[PDB]
Amino acid sequence: SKLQICVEPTSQKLMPGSTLVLQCVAVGSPIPHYQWFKNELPLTHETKKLYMVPYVDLEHQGTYWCHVYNDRDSQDSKKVEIIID
């Protein structure tokens, strides 16, 4: 079945100390895999539908997206901006 992202991440405007929660959910068979990126670099070990940072600071500001893939198809989520004010 067609790999397709159904839940797209959302941009957020956060304060230091707030929680960052990004989500990307896809359907498909074979079952989709995920890998999150920030500022063009993979976030190590962030291979889940959720990416969550409990207490944010300025270092978490940036542009994020998730690569979603299986052994036939792949899609990139929308790019979202996390602003830390």
Curated annotation (Swiss-Prot):
It comes from the Eukaryota. It is found in: Cytoplasm, Perinuclear region; Nucleus. Residues 2-81 form the Ig-like C2-type domain. Disulfide bonds join 24-66. Highly expressed in peripheral blood mononuclear cells. Detected at lower levels in bone marrow, thymus and lymph node, and at very low levels in colon and lung. Homooligomer; forms oligomers which bind to TRAF6. Forms a complex with CARD14 and MALT1; resulting in the formation of a CBM (CARD14-BCL10-MALT1) complex. Forms a complex with CARD11 and MALT1; resulting in the formation of a CBM (CARD11-BCL10-MALT1) complex. Forms a complex with CARD9 and MALT1; resulting in the formation of a CBM (CARD9-BCL10-MALT1) complex. It is linked to Immunodeficiency 12: A primary immunodeficiency characterized by onset in infancy of recurrent bacterial and candidal infections resulting in bronchiectasis and growth delay. Manifestations include mastoiditis, aphthous ulcers, cheilitis, gingivitis, esophagitis, gastritis, duodenitis, and meningitis. Levels of absolute lymphocytes and serum immunoglobulins are normal, but specific antibody titers are low despite immunization, and T-cells show impaired proliferative responses to mitogens. A chromosomal aberration involving MALT1 is recurrent in low-grade mucosa-associated lymphoid tissue (MALT lymphoma). Translocation t(11;18)(q21;q21) with BIRC2. This translocation is found in approximately 50% of cytogenetically abnormal low-grade MALT lymphoma. Belongs to the peptidase C14B family. Protease that enhances BCL10-induced activation: acts via formation of CBM complexes that channel adaptive and innate immune signaling downstream of CARD domain-containing proteins (CARD9, CARD11 and CARD14) to activate NF-kappa-B and MAP kinase p38 pathways which stimulate expression of genes encoding pro-inflammatory cytokines and chemokines. Mediates BCL10 cleavage: MALT1-dependent BCL10 cleavage plays an important role in T-cell antigen receptor-induced integrin adhesion. Involved in the induction of T helper 17 cells (Th17) differentiation. This is Mucosa-associated lymphoid tissue lymphoma translocation protein 1. It comes from Homo sapiens (Human). The lineage of its organism: Eukaryota, Metazoa, Chordata, Craniata, Vertebrata.
